[PDB]
Nucleic acid binder design. Structure first.
Ligand code: 2KH
Ligand code: MG
Ligand code: MG
Ligand code: ZN
Ligand code: ZN
Ligand code: ZN
Lengths: 138, 163, 155, 43, 559, 266, 47, 130, 196, 65, 114, 84
RNA sequence: AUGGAGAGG
């Protein structure tokens, strides 16, 4: 119906993308982040949602925009090393080695992208009542 | 540039002078220009210092450069180490690189030099020129599996009847 | 002025005015000969090289020149008798202790300091408008015919 | 599994740096560390 | 290179490492199984025949025990399978391969071995669980954390070689390193933050806690020090009870900034006769600095006393911190309202300055600096302005922080953190840069498809007004991702080239040593230095002293 | 009585909220510790699985089986299996209870704790019966069976301490708070602006008097009044939890005293 | 939950990693080095 | 016996980023050439502005510190605020002005006077009343 | 590891008695050191802790999506509404003594994940074992019960120390050692040593 | 897998509350918060134990073996 | 794999006694007692109760390592006062306080509802 | 050839390598049940016994210090100074 | 054994 297009980088070279769909409309909270006003007009395309710039592994990171980038990278690398339920039929497959978490849990802090990655159905970790403190020094 | 200068009263006082930095190097002709101090002129190219002023000035410039690279990161290494490096680079007569083209072309033992970079060709040419090995190189006794004459093995232990 | 030197003198002095519990309101039982000739003879025992020929002796005095400068600067008659007011016993103790600590500070023969130097240079390099750091160090060690930033500093 | 099934390999000026054109096509965060950094990428 | 210069060896082990606040500096926590596996041959002598008989009687699987028994003929008796593992008469001259036991000298190593401090001799203390355990003051010369780090251990197989380990490669002997003529070990992390929190003038300790801390010191004389406060309540100070860890005859003096023998801000450091007179103790003192306390105690009392000092300080400080507590929350990264406002308006006036300079440059009114392009001068100006902006907002953020701010406390202690962390977390993370320059134009005359062509504005070329507390925008996030990416890349490249350069350096000055005439030579006898280091002094026994003859006026000199 | 005092504020089958007066901090804290760990309780220690064609693994089920709360009223007149002279376990130290389940209907056949059947002889001792605080009367859900899935096993419950395993925990979370007004100043409050407005006000503030600003710091004061709330899992009643706690602490103190008595032997 | 997109060889699940390459039939001009005799090179990979 | 005794007038109180210890600045109400700076534990003995504290230096009232028992043994004080420190510096401003530096577990003190029997010794009992 | 590149191994394990405890009686399932925060700048860890706490209490699912207008201030407000410190702090008591702690502890739910690597899968030790066939040196790998390679850098370290005897021991008695016969004329391994 | 028998943090039994939780959710049509509140799960750790859990045994029972 | 048994935290080993009283060589009339198979639960209590005795000069306890459930307890009293007597009296004090506390809680519980 | 007992230029102080070597060799001898020339006084560890035997200068060994030219100087353990 | 993939500091 001509509502959405498929754009590669070469064609992306000659377009103007709006970051948010609210950047087409013509006192504030100090808490929120500082966002530069749209000084553009001739938009041809608009972004679906910026969070789509990430990959599958990076979409599991809570508030990745509040972290130093190499930390997001490290988490992206270590997420593939976490234990959980990799398949529902794990008890009928003869894999060389498979680890399945005893009691998986869907994280209290989720991403809207986690919905499509089936992470809340097949999680890889538990919510630990954590404490940041200096105790025994161990 | 700011600079500490001995005041006629005694104490060192900051006396700021004007110094000309330069992109481009040709020490052979710049120092002979009437107008500047021809005894304080310096280049970051120690290779030119070695050619123009001599091998000792080249040593000082080399140490200055290495020290500058080390201290550039705020670090600090004691003098004797860097000095040892620069000296072993400059004792041959010129600027001996720290590569297979530099010190590995020396007159040391065949095994020692063959234990680094080019191995087979070294053993070949050494086997062709009939070279004698002193076996007082560390890596050589390492190969031979002997107590190398280094540190604890730099001396011999014997007995003398004093009982 | 601040430079790495073998024996620390300050700690020895402040240890001297603690070991003997000297009061700063009492005339020292020293002599001009005691201090002057004492230090002058102290400089004789700071042996780094132990040869008998002239060459080795010259190399010796050249090797102990700086530390002797520090020694004379710190153990001046005025400074000894007024700055901390040392006694005879305390002074002899200071001299002997300085000698001993100096003889301890000598490098031990057999010390593989080549590898030690190479490691002492290579290790901090891992923790790293002209070119500096690892590429510049690479240039220096390779003796680059063409350096990325040739500069001429003219005074 | 999801991550491995959507992987990009690169053989051999600055092929390791995150290029601007990678916006929305390649993940800016997910890449192996140590050796094949920037070369191996994920969609 | 693979079989002669370095070959695989027996009597070796490797495991995941962890810290233990109750282990000595020269000790190593060794798992029981490793203690059962690794073995040492011990000749049967009248001095130890009983103990050896007991160990053989225990055999393997039970520590302490033995693995094999070698006779005179050379026959090897495998205890775990032999029919006579219960009845053995140990003859004099026989060897007994026993399990590794306590106080055994072993070589501890962590790759990459960059210097001699990467291989140090430790005393074995066999413990349960499967982790190599080490002190928190040996972590630095090894350069090791506990996020999965593994280390290797080698066992000597004769008396002379374990002597070589215990008399040369010992950890206390490696405290003062000849690399930077300074101690390479010190108090860090919780012990540092704790020793900072303890020596405060507000920190007072009542009777019971004082008694416990005192008893926690192994070298405690058993003499209760007279409390700084008598009436109304007998209270001690952190300094006063910390002094118990410091040996007698220790004199430390260091003036920092406005230190006038009274110290209104309680800075500097004065310690007399093993008793701290005044000054908050932190990294400048208890750390691994040149004139640090560790250096002093090491060169004065000895390496053993200094290691035991590490022990005492650690035990006491960790004990006090255990019952005091210390944390870190997001609240420690939150500046006041007006502070955040001043930060915002600072960034605003910065971007305004950039706007003025840009508009000036576009009108061809800009004058190029001598030796560089108009464009280069512009870039330099904008970059410098944004840097001054991040620094301004950063200092504005640091000033606002209280003394009770945990992050600021860790910064003060020197435990972990710095100014830039405060700046980026609370104020502004600043400008992103790749290859020394700001984010260039991947697309034609623009960095992203979300900008118009030719947009040299800060928020375009990769400037981030937002802090980590507020959150980054998509563009800011991507630019930051580019920068970080380059970080990882040049990191890998750096460790590669540094590794190679290090190898070359070592292979170059391999056979260089000092002979018995203080002459630095090589395998050819070629003199490098007639006198090593041009003075003949070892780098370890050297301290930076002031030559007060070279400075001052001639009048003051004469006076 | 004569020493410490107790003022019960709330009481139920699961919880007891009270105030402990005239006591040293160490005694209260140690009492908390004993209540948490060193109280004897009966729990599943052994599991003999005959047939297991369910989804869950063997020891996976054995785990939650062990974690099931059992009656531990007369646990004191039971004996440790390590103390009993019998082989393995008997009826004077252990309580054996079988478990047999099998999918029957097309729907999912649930397996709870009510399906556990006491087999061994209790001989008049109130013990072994799995606590069911459930409304429907099912209890802790062990697992779920399909249609043809079967689960046949037999558990052996032994006397143990929560210091050995958390499955022998007679209590859940013990609430503990002293000096709600920080008049002893054992805590230096963190803040950004106001230290009082940011930190909420405790419930136990109503029982004590607010500090007057016209008063200096009371340095001679100690920790006397404590506010506790003990919660029981169900195995042992709350009153019996705290009573057995006190009696346990007292018992081991008395054991140390007895050791002191024994060390006087020639 | 298995998304597929792989093969099975001898019981082993195999995945074909997408191989990145330069686009063919593209005209690109490159500036050559300084010691090089040629200054610019206009090349195209014909497919 | 006693080493020093005088009545001072508190002229300044300074809580330099502290909340339990305030540095005090007082002057002698007898000698116009005498002054005193002294860190005080306010949480125990509060010292407001414009107060007149009675200050005393003593040598006694080494061995370990036994339990108080003030109502059983010889306390030799009945003051309000007592401390124990160590002299570490004897500075001489002029011939008519001599200053001494005591350290009470970190709580420092500078006493400037003229006429003294204050020798470098561990013995330093500072007693303050009213 | 958490979900922010904050990895680390278990140093030790404490029972609930020794563990610190809040006034509610809640004990931390895990204790991490504060020092692993400022030098790494993982603010989103703390933020996800706060959010997970609020979402836990309120019984909802906290939205931790990347680019949203969810700020620490609103989350703090919500947490304060539930009767807790808005910045995630909690007054805790030292489990050993029961005495309060001066500083309050950042306490709350955080999603952690047990990573791949475990100690018992990494631990290795060999007194002596199977050698290779070609070079007669200790075999390679843990799964083959092999020995650790005494690398060139290790050799360099032992040289730096001066322990020559230890170097020889590591290069003879530890690894491979051979007795060979040499002719006194040509000096090669031509000797046909007929022993016995 | 299946609902954990007891809470990790403290140790309160939470295994008998799962079905009742689901009943409070879909039958009485309440939010997760109130449902967890009626089940006597005051502490947010016990609350977490049920709120965070995903019943995966239901998908496991789909297979025929 | 290398983990010690759980009962090793409250069950005494082979040849291990409960208390190990040793003469403190540091200060005169002092004693260091080694408590086996016990933790802070008993140590903190005993130590805190030893401070109540005004004839006790010193009293401190410590767990030298959390791996092993044992703690050392140093006690120092006045001359003519054997420290073991102080320990015993402290213990009996604890016992009496706990007994009275138990009686009080029971009598209080006998007056409650629900 | 050799170097006479007079005009010896090498350090009279025993180097750390010399001390470690002597202690090592002596500890080896003791480890192979050799006659001890000092009172054990409770010591049974061959290394410690070697150390105590070093402090009393009851070690009948000698040190041959090589010179880079080929010459050598002899220094008995009894004559050498142990200041470390 | 050769060769290859991925991962850990
Ligand atoms: O190839 C590699 C990669 C990593 N490493 C090692 O791994 C460590 C990374 O570990 P880390 O990044 O988690 N923290 P750290 O480096 O200790 O720095 P800081 O936050 O200031 O405390 C680095 O310090 C290297 O020593 C290697 O040795 N080799
Ligand atoms: Mg680190
Ligand atoms: Mg690491
Ligand atoms: Zn039985
Ligand atoms: Zn021949
Ligand atoms: Zn709970």
């Amino acid at each position: 119906e001509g509502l959405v297009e498929y754009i590669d980088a070469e064609e992306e070279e000659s377009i103007l993308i709006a970051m948010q769909p609210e950047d087409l409309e013509p006192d504030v909270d100090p808490a929120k982040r500082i966002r530069v006003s749209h000084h553009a007009t001739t938009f041809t395309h608009c972004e679906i949602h910026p969070s789509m710039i990430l990959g599958v592994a990076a979409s599991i990171i809570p508030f990745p925009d509040h972290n130093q980038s190499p930390r997001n990278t490290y988490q992206s690398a270590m997420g593939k090393q976490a234990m959980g339920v990799f398949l529902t039929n794990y008890n009928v497959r003869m894999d060389t080695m498979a680890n399945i978490l005893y009691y998986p849990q869907k994280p209290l802090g989720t991403t809207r992208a986690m919905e499509y990655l089936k992470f809340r159905e097949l999680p890889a970790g538990q919510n630990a009542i954590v404490a940041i403190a200096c105790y025994s020094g161990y | 540039y700011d600079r500490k200068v001995p005041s006629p009263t005694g104490e060192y006082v900051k006396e700021p002078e004007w110094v000309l930095e330069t992109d481009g190097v040709n020490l052979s002709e710049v120092m002979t220009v009437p107008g500047i101090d021809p005894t304080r002129i310096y280049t970051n190219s120690f290779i030119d210092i070695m050619e123009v002023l001599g091998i000792e000035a080249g040593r000082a410039a080399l140490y200055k450069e290495v020290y500058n690279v080390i201290a550039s990161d705020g670090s600090y290494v004691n003098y004797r180490h860097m000095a040892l490096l620069v000296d072993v680079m400059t004792t041959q007569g010129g600027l001996t690189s720290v590569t297979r083209h530099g010190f590995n072309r020396s007159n040391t033992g065949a095994l020692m030099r063959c234990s680094f970079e080019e191995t087979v060709e070294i053993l070949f040419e050494a086997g062709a020129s009939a070279e004698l090995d002193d076996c007082r190189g560390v890596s050589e006794n390492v190969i031979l599996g002997q107590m190398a004459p280094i540190g604890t093995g730099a001396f011999d232990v014997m007995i003398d009847e004093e009982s | 002025a601040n430079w790495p030197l073998p024996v620390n003198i300050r700690r020895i002095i402040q240890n001297a005015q603690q070991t003997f519990h000297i009061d700063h309101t009492k005339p020292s039982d020293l002599t001009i000969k005691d201090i002057v000739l004492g230090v002058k003879d102290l400089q004789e025992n700071l042996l780094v090289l132990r040869g008998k020929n002239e060459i080795i002796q010259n190399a010796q005095r050249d090797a102990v020149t700086l530390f002797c400068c520090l020694l004379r600067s710190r153990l001046a008659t005025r400074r000894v008798l007024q700055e901390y007011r040392l006694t005879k016993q305390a002074f002899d103790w200071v001299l002997s202790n300085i000698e001993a600590q100096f003889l301890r500070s000598v490098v031990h023969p057999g010390e593989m300091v080549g590898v030690l130097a190479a490691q002492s240079i290579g290790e901090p390099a891992t923790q790293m408008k002209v070119t500096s750091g690892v590429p510049r160090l690479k240039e220096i060690l390779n003796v680059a015919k063409n350096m990325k930033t040739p500069s001429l500093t003219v005074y | 599994t999801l991550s491995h099934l959507r992987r990009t390999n690169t053989p051999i000026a600055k092929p390791r740096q995150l290029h601007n054109t990678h916006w929305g096509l390649v993940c800016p965060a997910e890449t192996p560390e140590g050796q094949a950094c920037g070369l191996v990428k994920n969609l | 290179r693979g079989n002669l210069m370095g070959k695989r060896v027996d009597f070796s082990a490797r495991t995941v490492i962890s810290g233990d606040p109750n282990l000595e500096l020269d000790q190593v926590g060794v798992p029981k199984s490793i203690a059962k596996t690794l073995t040492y041959p011990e000749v049967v002598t009248p001095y130890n025949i009983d103990r050896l008989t007991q160990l053989v009687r225990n055999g393997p699987n039970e520590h302490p025990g033995a693995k094999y028994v070698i006779r005179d003929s050379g026959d090897r008796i495998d205890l775990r399978y032999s029919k006579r593992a219960g009845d053995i008469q140990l003859q004099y001259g026989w060897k007994v391969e026993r399990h590794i036991m306590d106080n055994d000298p072993v070589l501890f190593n962590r790759q990459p071995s960059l210097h001699k401090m990467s291989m140090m001799a430790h005393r074995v203390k066999v413990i349960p669980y499967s982790t190599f355990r080490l002190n928190l003051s040996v972590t630095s010369p090894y350069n090791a954390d506990f996020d999965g780090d593994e280390m290797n251990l080698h066992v000597p197989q004769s008396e002379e070689t374990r002597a070589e380990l215990s008399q040369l490669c010992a950890v206390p002997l490696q405290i003062v390193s000849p690399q930077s003529n300074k101690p390479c070990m010190g108090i860090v992390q919780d012990t540092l933050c704790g020793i900072r929190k303890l020596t405060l003038r507000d920190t007072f300790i009542e009777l019971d806690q004082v008694l416990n801390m005192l008893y926690w010191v192994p070298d405690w004389d058993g003499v209760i020090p007279t409390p700084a406060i008598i009436k109304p309540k007998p209270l001690w100070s952190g300094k006063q009870i910390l002094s118990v860890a410091i040996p007698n005859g220790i004199h430390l003096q260091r003036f920092d900034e406005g230190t006038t023998l009274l110290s209104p801000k309680d800075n500097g450091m004065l310690i007399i006769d093993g008793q701290i007179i005044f000054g908050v103790v932190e990294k400048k003192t208890v750390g691994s600095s040149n004139g640090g306390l560790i250096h002093v105690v090491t060169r004065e009392k000895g390496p053993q006393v200094c290691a035991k000092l590490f022990g005492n300080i650690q035990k006491v400080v960790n004990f006090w911190l255990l019952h005091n507590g210390f944390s870190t929350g997001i609240g420690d990264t939150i500046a006041d309202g007006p502070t955040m406002r001043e930060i915002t308006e600072t960034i605003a006036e910065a971007k305004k300055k950039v706007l003025d300079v840009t508009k000036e440059a576009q009108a061809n009114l800009l004058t190029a600096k001598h030796g560089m392009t108009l464009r280069e001068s512009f870039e330099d100006n904008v970059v410098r302005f944004l840097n001054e902006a991040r620094d301004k907002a950063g200092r504005l953020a640091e000033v606002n922080l209280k003394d009770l701010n945990n992050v600021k406390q860790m910064v003060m202690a020197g435990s972990k953190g710095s100014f830039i962390n405060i700046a980026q977390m609370s104020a502004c993370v600043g400008q992103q840069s790749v290859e020394g320059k700001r984010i260039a134009f991947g697309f034609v005359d623009r960095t992203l498809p979300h900008f118009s062509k030719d947009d040299y504005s800060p928020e375009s070329k990769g400037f981030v007004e937002n802090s980590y507390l507020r959150g980054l925008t998509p563009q800011e996030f991507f630019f930051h991702a580019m920068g970080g990416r380059e970080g990882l890349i040049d990191t890998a490249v750096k460790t590669a080239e540094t590794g190679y350069i290090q190898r070359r350096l070592v292979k170059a000055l391999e056979d260089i040593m000092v002979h018995y005439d203080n002459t630095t030579r090589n395998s050819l006898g070629n003199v490098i230095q007639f006198i090593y280091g041009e003075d003949g002094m070892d780098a370890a026994h050297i301290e930076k002293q002031s030559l007060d003859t070279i400075g001052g006026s001639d009048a003051a000199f004469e006076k | 009585e004569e020493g410490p005092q107790v003022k019960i504020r709330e009481a139920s089958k699961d919880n007891v909220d009270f105030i402990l007066s005239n006591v040293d901090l160490a005694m209260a804290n140690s009492l908390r510790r004993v209540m948490i760990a060193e109280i004897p309780t009966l729990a599943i220690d052994s599991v003999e699985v005959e047939t297991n064609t369910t989804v869950l693994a063997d020891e996976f089920i054995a785990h939650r089986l062990g974690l099931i709360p059992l009656q531990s009223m007369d646990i004191e007149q039971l004996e440790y299996s390590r103390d009993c002279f019998c082989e393995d376990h008997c009826d004077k130290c252990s309580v054996v209870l079988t478990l047999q389940a099998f999918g029957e209907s097309e729907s999912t056949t649930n397996v709870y704790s009510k399906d556990l059947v006491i087999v061994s002889n209790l001989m008049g001792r109130n013990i072994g019966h799995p606590i069911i605080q459930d409304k429907e009367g099912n209890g802790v859900l062990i697992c779920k069976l399909r249609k043809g899935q079967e689960l046949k096993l037999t558990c052996v419950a032994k006397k143990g301490i929560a210091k050995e395993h958390a499955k022998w925990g007679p209590a859940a979370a013990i609430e503990f708070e002293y000096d709600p007004w920080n008049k002893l100043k054992h805590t230096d409050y963190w803040y950004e602006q106001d230290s009082a407005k940011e930190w909420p006000q405790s419930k136990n503030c109503e029982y004590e008097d607010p500090p007057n600003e016209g008063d200096p710091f009371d340095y001679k004061a100690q920790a006397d009044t404590f506010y506790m709330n003990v919660e029981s899992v169900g195995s042992i009643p709350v009153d019996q939890v705290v009573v057995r706690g006190i009696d346990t602490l007292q018992k081991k103190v008395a054991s140390i005293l007895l050791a002191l008595t024994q060390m006087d032997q020639d | 939950f298995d998304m597929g997109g792989y093969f099975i060889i001898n019981g082993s699940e195999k995945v074909l990693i997408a191989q990145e390459r330069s686009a063919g039939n593209i005209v690109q001009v490159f500036k050559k080095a300084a010691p090089s005799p040629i200054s610019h090179v206009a090349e195209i990979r014909s497919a | 016996n006693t080493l020093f005794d005088d009545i001072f007038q508190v002229s300044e109180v300074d809580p330099g980023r502290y909340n339990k210890v305030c540095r005090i600045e007082a002057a002698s109400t007898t000698q116009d050439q005498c002054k005193l700076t002294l860190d005080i534990n306010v949480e125990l003995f509060p010292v407001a502005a414009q107060d007149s504290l009675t200050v005393t230096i003593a040598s006694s009232l080494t061995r370990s510190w036994r339990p108080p028992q003030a109502g059983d043994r010889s306390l030799a004080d009945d003051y309000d605020y007592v401390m124990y420190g160590t002299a570490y510096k004897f500075e001489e401003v002029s011939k008519d002005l001599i200053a001494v530096y005591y350290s009470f577990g970190g709580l420092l003190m500078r006493l400037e006077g003229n006429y003294l029997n204050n020798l470098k010794q561990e013995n330093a009992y500072l007693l303050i009343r009213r | 590891a958490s979900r922010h590149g904050q990895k680390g191994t278990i140093g030790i394990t404490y029972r609930r008695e020794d563990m610190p405890f809040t006034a509610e009686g809640i004990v931390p399932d895990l204790i991490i050191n504060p020092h692993a925060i400022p030098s790494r700048m993982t603010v989103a860890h703390l933020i996800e802790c706060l959010l997970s706490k609020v979402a836990a209490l309120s019984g909802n699912e906290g939205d931790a999506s990347p680019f949203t207008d969810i700020t620490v201030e609103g989350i703090s407000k919500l947490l304060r509404e539930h009767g807790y410190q808005s910045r995630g702090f909690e007054v805790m008591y030292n489990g050993h003594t029961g005495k309060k702690l001066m500083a309050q502890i950042f306490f709350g739910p955080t999603y952690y994940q047990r990573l791949r690597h475990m100690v018992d899968d990494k631990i290795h030790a060999r007194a002596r074992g199977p050698m290779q066939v070609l070079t007669r040196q200790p075999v390679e790998g843990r799964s083959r019960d092999g020995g650790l390679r005494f690398g060139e850098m290790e050799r360099d370290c032992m040289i730096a120390h001066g322990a020559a005897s230890f170097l020889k021991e590591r290069l003879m008695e530890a690894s491979d050692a051979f007795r060979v016969h040499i002719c006194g004329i040509c000096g090669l391994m031509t000797v046909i040593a007929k022993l016995n | 897998m299946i609902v954990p028998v007891r809470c990790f943090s403290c140790g309160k039994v939470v295994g008998d509350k799962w079905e009742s939780y689901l009943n409070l959710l879909q039958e009485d049509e309440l939010d997760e918060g109130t449902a967890l509140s009626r089940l006597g799960l005051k502490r947010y750790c016990c609350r977490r134990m049920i709120l965070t859990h995903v019943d995966l045994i239901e998908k496991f029972l789909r297979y025929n073996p | 794999m290398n983990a010690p048994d759980r009962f090793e935290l409250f069950l005494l080993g082979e040849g291990e006694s409960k208390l190990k009283i040793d003469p403190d060589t540091k200060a005169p009339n002092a004693v260091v007692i080694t408590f086996e198979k016990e933790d802070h639960t008993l140590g903190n209590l005993i130590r805190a109760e030893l401070l109540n005795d005004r004839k006790v000069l010193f009293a401190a306890y410590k767990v030298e390592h959390p791996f092993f459930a044992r703690f050392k307890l140093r006690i120092q009293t006045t001359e003519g006062y054997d420290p073991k007597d102080a320990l015993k009296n402290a213990c009996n004090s604890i016992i009496n306080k706990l007994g009275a506390l138990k009686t009080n809680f029971e009598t209080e519980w006998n007056l409650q509802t629900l | 050839k050799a170097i006479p007992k007079d005009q010896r230029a090498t350090t009279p102080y025993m180097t750390k390598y010399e001390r470690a070597r002597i202690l090592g060799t002596r500890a080896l001898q003791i480890s192979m049940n050799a006659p001890v020339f000092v009172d054990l006084e409770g010591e049974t560890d061959p290394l410690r016994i070697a150390m105590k035997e070093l402090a009393e200068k009851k070690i009948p060994l000698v040190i041959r210090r090589y010179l880079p030219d080929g010459s050598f100087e002899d220094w008995s353990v009894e004559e050498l100074i142990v200041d470390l």
